Amino acid sequence: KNKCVNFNFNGLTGTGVLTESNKKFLPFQQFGRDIADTTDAVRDPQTL
Amino acid sequence: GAISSVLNDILSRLDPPEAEVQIDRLITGRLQSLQTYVTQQLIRAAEIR
């Protein structure tokens, strides 16, 4: 966490940092998007 | 007119013989959007002047 590291979450690439979540999600939710069509949150497939 | 709207999507699914065609449709699409914003800002900057 807390470093500009490249990502590969089941094909979803990117470059950014990792920060712990504060808002709640649906139990059937996988990822979220903002108004800019950008990935704002992603879930680890092996860890909840 | 391209496949997707993400540049990392086209570079990961296609080959560089064919990937440059879809980037060409995305560069010319976004270049006309930046020329529109500057031109409409330059007319609004004259009325405040």
Swiss-Prot record, chain B:
Source organism of the structure: Severe acute respiratory syndrome coronavirus 2
Variant or mutagenesis effect after changing residue 12 to A: In strain: Alpha/B.1.1.7
Known role: Subunit of the fusion protein that is processed upon entry into the host cell. Mediates fusion of the virion and cellular membranes by functioning as a class I viral fusion protein. Contains a viral fusion peptide that is unmasked after S2 cleavage. This cleavage can occur at the cell membrane by host TMPRSS2 or during endocytosis by host CSTL. In either case, this triggers an extensive and irreversible conformational change that leads to fusion of the viral envelope with the cellular cytoplasmic membrane, releasing viral genomic RNA into the host cell cytoplasm.
Residues represented out of the complete protein: 971 to 1019 of 1273
Name of this chain's protein: Spike protein S2'
